[PDB]
Design a protein around this nucleic acid. Structure first.
Ligand SMILES: Nc1ccn([C@@H]2O[C@H](COP(=O)(O)O)[C@@H](O)[C@H]2O)c(=O)n1
Ligand SMILES: [Mg+2]
Ligand SMILES: [Mg+2]
Ligand SMILES: [Mg+2]
Ligand SMILES: [Mg+2]
Ligand SMILES: [Mg+2]
Ligand SMILES: [Mg+2]
Ligand SMILES: [Mg+2]
Ligand SMILES: [Mg+2]
Lengths: 49, 95, 64, 110, 243, 95
RNA sequence: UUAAUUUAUUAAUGCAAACAGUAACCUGCAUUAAAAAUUUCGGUUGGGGCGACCUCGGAGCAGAACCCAACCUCCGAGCAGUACAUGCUAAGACUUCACCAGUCAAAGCGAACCUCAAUUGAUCCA
RNA sequence: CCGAGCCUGGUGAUAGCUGGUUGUCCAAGAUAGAAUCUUAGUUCAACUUUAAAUUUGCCCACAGAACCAAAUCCCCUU
RNA sequence: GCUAAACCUAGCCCCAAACCCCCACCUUACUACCAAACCUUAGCCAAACCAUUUACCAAAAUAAAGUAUAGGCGAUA
């Protein structure tokens, strides 16, 4: 998902990526109400990143 | 006095609002009755010379019933206010 | 550019204006939005109606 | 939605590949979605009924139907059953063929 | 139809439109204020939040007060915020048992009190909570002048308050002359609770008494129009003599 | 089950269901065996293990519990270290 | 009412609480009474009542896969022994015609080198 | 119109009980059982209906099913 | 061809807005004239009985959320 957002320009990798930036590029939807404490990175696509 | 507690928990209201109460909210449970706990003492300053429970100008511990029925109605003693702490210690310094 | 909403174009009562709901929910919302300004026996009829519709929608029909 | 940047070698990591300029001379056209993706989707209508939808088709949807049938006849061993929607411009295919059809539409250049 | 205003607000509308509007400002301030009493029959949570058991999470706690009931004998005396607790109780301190009515009453005494400001011995129906609050207030005069309207919770107690407050605000010859230095000692001892007379006359009244006092102020037996018109004519003739 | 509350107009959950069963996101409900920690002295070891398992529920039991809860209990939860995160989804389930 | 639950109310005690002392009445908490007050009064049944039964197992009706009623015909159980692998796991199955429950079990790890006709009981509490 | 008056309100009480439930036309459609303060009811099953996916279903004779009648079960083939 | 049958506006309903109202008469009212208010709703009803419990009514949008929580831990809240 991260690489998909970077290649389609939805996340700028030239500036720090932060919860705001992932939300603003709409890669992760966080619901604080409903007890989301944030985002965990996931090894799912680690082969080609 | 009688201190009660509610058996059932009252749901919180808002920060400005008043809670909503029901039948289960006026089922009660006594927790304590301050009528009968061991009796305390109140601090009086005795302003005459009385029997050896106190002497003139002395702050003493007196049983509540005796202090409220004898020393204060007859003016024999006064309450241990900070004001008359200062006043009677000034009197003792003058003495 | 999105500074109004057609639900703000709706002219109607306050408790159903930009809302739909069913007959019980309409009565519940009318009681809590405009209930303290209602005439006394209109409230009494509204409370009777919420009470009846509660019993009806929660205890009758098929599909229990 | 930002139009995506100009990478050097395509397909990129994660496999994105832009629509082929100039457009292919075909009887039909398939638009990318707003997120610049191929518009082939899985669908499931009971616990059972699994379909693939191609759903931004412009032009000759019956030409597309014939080409999908030609392509998917080796993969199945029959002729797939399809539901053409000339109105909404979509094609339904019975069975899950999303990865195969996506690769096929990128091959065409859509 | 609907009322323009809600029915819980009808009373404020009266207090704005009537002779209740011509009541003085500070009195209507108190009537609108109407704050909360002191805990007497319930134990307050010392904190606004509490880690409740069974899960170590802080839930907010509010302390809700018991609906206490005060009889007219209480208002004839002084009970220290203490009244009857009319409630239910479970039969054997066990909810899976009968639930059954209960009335908890206070213990009532006929005590005799001297007030140094009024110089009078009053016999009243007190309880131990009043006696203890008097001891921690260092006298009945201080208790009544310091305690708030609803913590005092007596029509009689607030009559005593405005009598004492008017005594202070006018600095009356309270015992008699030949002791003006002792009177100065009294008013100096209680000099801190000094308010204007125009406020102390309205301290402690009910709204019925306040409206009655106000209309007694504004009765004003009508002025004859003979007087009004001869005043106007004399003014006009003096204007003509000037011109 | 309270399809329409008197307060909100909303549908209510049976907290008995939430105390006893676990809803996996695919629609499977997982329970304990009724009797799994009583009279273990007189139960045989194989029956004791059969009682110790966590089991799945029937289709009509699943649909009943689906009905008896609301959709808060049917969302997808991403807890930190979860012993059922692998069980929340169905793999190779053909038909 | 000699059924269940309660004494909130009254009563007479006791204990504190509020007075007088000397070298009674009011309030709070307990108890036993009275008056009550709330509440209920299973099922099958060749009408209902009386009488008997109510769970589980073996046999016959039901002769040869499975099933198959009875206020049908008969016989039994609410455990007992032996050690305490009477461990732990896990393919695949059976199932008392539903669910709950019940039953078997290869392989694997750890080891010595169960008998049993029913032989029993859920949930919440504690 | 008294084994506990009458009136209003709660109140559209509750009713596993009775009674009733209004155009046309086609189609598919029938009596296992288990538990239940349960047999005048309900829930699960079976059956019934609809839509869906997919590949085998039904009927058979040969082989086969224990010692202490009529017939059933199983299915390779039709 | 009798009895009839036909009719349309008298008004009403739900909203919005806006806060509304000479005499006699509590004695046997409508009669010219004589020595004191303030105290928990209960229960039907749900729990397929009922005995703790059982929505709201006693001003409070949308969402949080039918969540935390309560509960013969059950109906339900
Ligand atoms: N674990 C237990 C067992 C019994 N008990 C009590 O003992 C009683 C025993 O019932 P009877 O004596 O049959 C229960 O009703 C309960 O009051 C308990 O409180 N906790
Ligand atoms: Mg809020
Ligand atoms: Mg879909
Ligand atoms: Mg019978
Ligand atoms: Mg079975
Ligand atoms: Mg009815
Ligand atoms: Mg019945
Ligand atoms: Mg037919
Ligand atoms: Mg009931």
């Amino acid at each position: 998902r991260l690489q998909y957002l970077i290649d389609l320009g939805r996340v700028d990798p030239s500036q720090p990526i932060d919860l705001t930036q992932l939300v603003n590029g709409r890669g992760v939807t966080i619901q604080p109400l409903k007890r989301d404490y944030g985002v965990q990175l996931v090894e799912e696509g680690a082969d080609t990143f | 006095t009688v201190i009660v507690e509610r058996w059932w928990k009252v749901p919180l209201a808002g920060e400005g609002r008043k809670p909503r109460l029901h039948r289960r909210h006026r089922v009660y449970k006594l927790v304590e009755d301050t009528k009968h706990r061991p009796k305390e003492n109140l601090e009086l300053i005795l302003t005459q010379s009385v029997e050896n429970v106190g002497v003139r100008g002395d702050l003493v511990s007196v049983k509540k019933s005796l202090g409220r029925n004898r020393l204060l109605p007859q003016g024999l003693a006064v309450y241990a206010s900070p004001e008359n702490k200062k006043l009677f210690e000034e009197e003792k310094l003058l003495r | 550019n999105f500074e109004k909403h057609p639900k703000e174009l709706i002219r109607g009562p306050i408790w159903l204006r930009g809302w739909k709901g069913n007959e019980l929910q309409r009565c519940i919302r009318k009681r809590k939005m405009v209930g303290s300004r209602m005439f006394a026996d209109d409230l009494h009829n509204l409370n009777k109606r919420i009470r009846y519709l509660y019993k009806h929608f929660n205890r009758h029909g098929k599909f229990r | 939605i930002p139009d995506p940047p100009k990478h050097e070698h395509y397909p990129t990591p994660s496999g994105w590949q832009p629509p082929r300029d100039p457009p292919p001379n075909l009887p039909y056209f398939v638009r990318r979605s707003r997120m610049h993706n191929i518009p082939v989707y899985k669908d499931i209508t009971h616990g059972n009924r699994q379909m693939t939808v191609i759903r931004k088709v412009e032009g000759d949807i019956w030409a597309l139907q014939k080409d999908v049938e030609d392509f998917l006849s080796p993969l199945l061993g029959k002729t797939p059953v399809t539901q053409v929607n000339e109105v909404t411009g979509t094609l339904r295919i019975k069975g899950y063929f999303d990865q195969e059809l996506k690769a096929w539409l990128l091959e065409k250049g859509f | 139809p609907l009322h323009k205003y809600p029915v819980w607000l009808w009373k404020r509308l009266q207090l704005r439109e009537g002779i209740c509007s011509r009541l003085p400002g500070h009195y209507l301030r108190s009537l609108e204020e109407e704050r909360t009493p002191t805990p007497v029959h319930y134990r307050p949570h010392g904190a606004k939040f509490k880690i409740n058991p069974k899960n170590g999470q802080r839930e907010r706690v509010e302390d809700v007060p018991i609906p206490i009931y005060f009889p007219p004998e209480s208002q004839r005396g002084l009970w220290g915020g203490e009244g009857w607790i009319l409630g239910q109780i479970y039969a054997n301190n066990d909810k899976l048992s009968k639930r059954l009515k209960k009335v908890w009453k206070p213990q009532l005494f006929e005590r005799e009190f001297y007030s140094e400001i009024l110089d009078k011995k009053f016999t009243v129906t007190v309880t131990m909570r009043t006696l203890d609050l008097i001891d921690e207030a260092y006298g009945l005069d201080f208790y009544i002048l310091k305690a708030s309207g609803e913590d005092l919770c007596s029509k009689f107690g607030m009559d005593l308050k405005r009598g004492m407050l008017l005594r202070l605000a006018r600095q009356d010859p309270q015992l008699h002359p030949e002791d003006p230095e002792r009177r100065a000692a009294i008013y100096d001892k209680y000099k801190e609770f000094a308010i204007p007379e125009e406020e102390a006359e309205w301290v402690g009244l009910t709204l019925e008494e306040a409206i009655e006092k106000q209309r007694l102020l504004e009765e004003k037996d009508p002025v004859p129009l003979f007087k009004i018109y001869v005043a106007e004519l004399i003014q006009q003739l003096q204007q003509q003599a000037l011109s | 089950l309270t399809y329409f509350s008197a307060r909100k107009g909303k549908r209510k959950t049976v907290k008995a269901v939430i105390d006893r069963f676990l809803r996996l996101h695919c629609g499977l409900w997982v329970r304990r065996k009724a009797g799994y920690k009583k009279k273990l002295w007189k139960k045989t070891p194989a029956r004791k293990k059969r009682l110790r398992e966590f089991v799945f529920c029937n289709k009509t039991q699943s649909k009943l519990l689906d009905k008896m809860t609301t959709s808060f209990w049917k969302r997808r939860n991403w807890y930190v270290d979860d012993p059922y995160q692998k069980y929340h989804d169905r793999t190779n389930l053909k038909v």
